[PDB]
């Protein structure tokens, strides 16, 4: 996932 706050993901990713 990236390095966010909160975190950008789009399911399941690193």
Same mark, same amino acid.
């Given at each position: 996932?990236?390095?966010? #706050? +909160? +975190? #950008?993901?789009?399911? /399941?990713? /690193?």
């Amino acid at each position: 996932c990236t390095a966010s #706050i +909160p +975190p #950008i993901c789009h399911x /399941r990713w /690193r």
